[PDB]
């Protein structure tokens, strides 16, 4: 009879409880305090204009129906009590295919405080959309967003909030960086009110500022292009009495420039505008072609 008192507390807690009704349905506004702990900022896919993130997503609110009084001041309950009470229906406005992990059990956390305050934490991997403008590729800086809010609960029913100071709410771990190509500079939270065909909803926005690293594209494309341009300019020091020599020079440097341009344009998505690697490759191709036409003229 050591766990019978807690069983009685939990049974009395859910006796007369409707998990279809938010706390204060026609009396008050539900105040949800949100928190995000990023455990790893996943890889940013450039061809889908998306990114992946893995977060501990914490939400706190106050339900006056879940007041208890017992030998403990906080009940750290399972992840199956959360499905028997009202929890907010938070979704990610720009999510593509997110997963809420349930290995080995549903990675959810429920803590009820004796005055009725609940802390509800989830572990989930979000794959969100990051619309990018690739004018300055590969020397571009982005602000990948992560917008969430409540599905079906408007501003007069459920409002969101950060639980700590907004500059200290979205917290990224130190070892949590799965970025190969980018660099996470900082975070940036925001709050607003969007309006859709069902009403006005509160939306909590987070921006992660990424700055692409050029050290790969340099060695991949920029150094072969400059080497090819210099090797094309080598031909200007040869004697004109060797016509096949300079001919094979010109045609093979144009051939390597074509292969490099094709091999370089597969990196980024199938965008319809010109980037800065495309401008660099175009100017380098112009220089090579100028060398060949100069050879043709001489």
């Amino acid at each position, epitope marked *: 009879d050591n766990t019978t008192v807690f069983t009685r507390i939990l049974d009395r807690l859910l006796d007369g409880y409707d998990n279809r009704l938010r706390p204060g349905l026609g009396e008050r506004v539900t105040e949800v305090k949100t928190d995000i702990f990023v455990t790893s900022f996943g890889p940013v896919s450039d061809h889908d204009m998306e990114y992946t993130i893995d977060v501990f997503f914490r939400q706190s609110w*106050k339900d006056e129906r879940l007041k208890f009084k017992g030998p403990m001041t906080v009940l750290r309950l399972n992840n199956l009590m959360a499905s028997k009470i009202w929890t907010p229906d938070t979704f990610f406005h720009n999510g593509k295919k997110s997963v809420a992990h349930n290995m080995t059990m549903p990675n959810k956390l429920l803590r009820i405080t004796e005055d009725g305050t609940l802390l509800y934490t989830m572990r989930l991997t979000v794959r969100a959309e990051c619309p990018m403008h690739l004018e300055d590729f590969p020397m571009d800086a982005h602000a990948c967003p992560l917008k969430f809010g409540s599905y079906a609960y408007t501003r007069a029913e459920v409002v969101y909030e950060w639980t700590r*100071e*907004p500059a200290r709410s979205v917290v990224v771990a130190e070892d949590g960086s799965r970025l190969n190509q980018y660099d996470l500079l900082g975070q940036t939270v925001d709050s607003g009110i969007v309006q859709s065909s069902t009403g006005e909803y509160v939306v909590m926005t987070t921006h992660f500022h990424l700055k692409r690293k050029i050290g790969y594209f340099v060695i991949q494309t920029y150094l072969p292009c400059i080497m090819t341009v210099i090797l094309s300019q080598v031909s200007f020091w040869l004697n004109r009495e060797s016509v096949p020599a300079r001919t094979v020079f010109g045609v093979t440097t144009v051939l390597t420039m074509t292969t490099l341009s094709i091999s370089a344009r597969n990196s980024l998505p199938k965008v319809a505008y010109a980037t800065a690697m495309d401008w660099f490759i175009a100017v380098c191709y112009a220089f090579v072609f100028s060398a060949l036409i100069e050879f043709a003229t001489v």
Partner: antibody
Framework: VQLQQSGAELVKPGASVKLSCTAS????????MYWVKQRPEQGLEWIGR????????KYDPKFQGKATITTDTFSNTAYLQLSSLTSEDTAVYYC???????????WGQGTSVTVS | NIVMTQSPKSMSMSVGERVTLSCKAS??????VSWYQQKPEQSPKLLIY???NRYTGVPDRFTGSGSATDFTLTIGSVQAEDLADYHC????????FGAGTKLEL
């Protein structure tokens, strides 16, 4: 809905003071409590921050080590303790309540602390 | 420490016209800037929260306009009781206020 602070008083240079702020109309375990200091005909200055539910506090770097904020949930009060006073501490101290998108919507009546 | 620069320090104007106050931040404060009104020998009262969100109990003549760095408060058709000090304060980080703005007739 209402925040009631203590009364104005004088204090000798070098002593310690304990200002109080009694909340009525809500539970302090729900929101944060801010302490703000205002000089005569100057701008407001933020002293510190307390989270009454957990108990952890933050302070302005200028006021770090000078002020100590504590709470008492039984009497529904919040306290601000000032130590090692100087002559530039003659001000009006306000007790504010966080709410509605981090705005400090509800303020106290303000206590006048004078250093003679 | 995010600093808020308010402008102007003082402004004298009559009753009925439109007036505008500006506030600028050093760092980023994304629509977390509140505007308070403090009358002489009184406590500050919240006028605008968020960046553009009228507090429940304020007239419609106050309007806020927000950004990431530049914020403004516009009062159209002022009255004789809208004279007070006005402070802008950010809340994106630990709160810091502006210098203030006196309003005289």
């Amino acid at each position: 809905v209402q925040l009631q602070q203590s009364g104005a008083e004088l204090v000798k240079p070098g002593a310690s003071v304990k200002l109080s702020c009694t909340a009525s109309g809500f539970n302090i375990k729900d929101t944060y409590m801010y302490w703000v200091k205002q000089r005569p005909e100057q701008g407001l200055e933020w002293i510190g921050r307390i989270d009454p539910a957990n108990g952890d506090t933050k302070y302005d770097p200028k006021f770090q080590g000078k002020a100590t904020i504590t709470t008492d949930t039984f009497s529904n009060t919040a306290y601000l303790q000032l130590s090692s006073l100087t002559s530039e501490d003659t001000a009006v101290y306000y007790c504010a309540r966080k709410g509605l998108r981090w705005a400090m919507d509800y303020w106290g009546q303000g206590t006048s602390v004078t250093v003679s | 420490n995010i600093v808020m620069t308010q402008s102007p320090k003082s402004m004298s104007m009559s009753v009925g016209e439109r007036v505008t106050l500006s506030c600028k931040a050093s760092e980023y404060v994304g629509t977390y800037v509140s505007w308070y009104q403090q009358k002489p020998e009184q406590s500050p009262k919240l006028l605008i929260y968020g960046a553009s969100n009228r507090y429940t109990g304020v007239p419609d003549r106050f309007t806020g306009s927000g950004s990431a760095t530049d914020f403004t408060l516009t009062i159209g058709s002022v009255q004789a009781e809208d004279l007070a000090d006005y402070h802008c304060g950010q809340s994106y980080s630990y709160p810091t206020f502006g210098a203030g703005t006196k309003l005289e007739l």
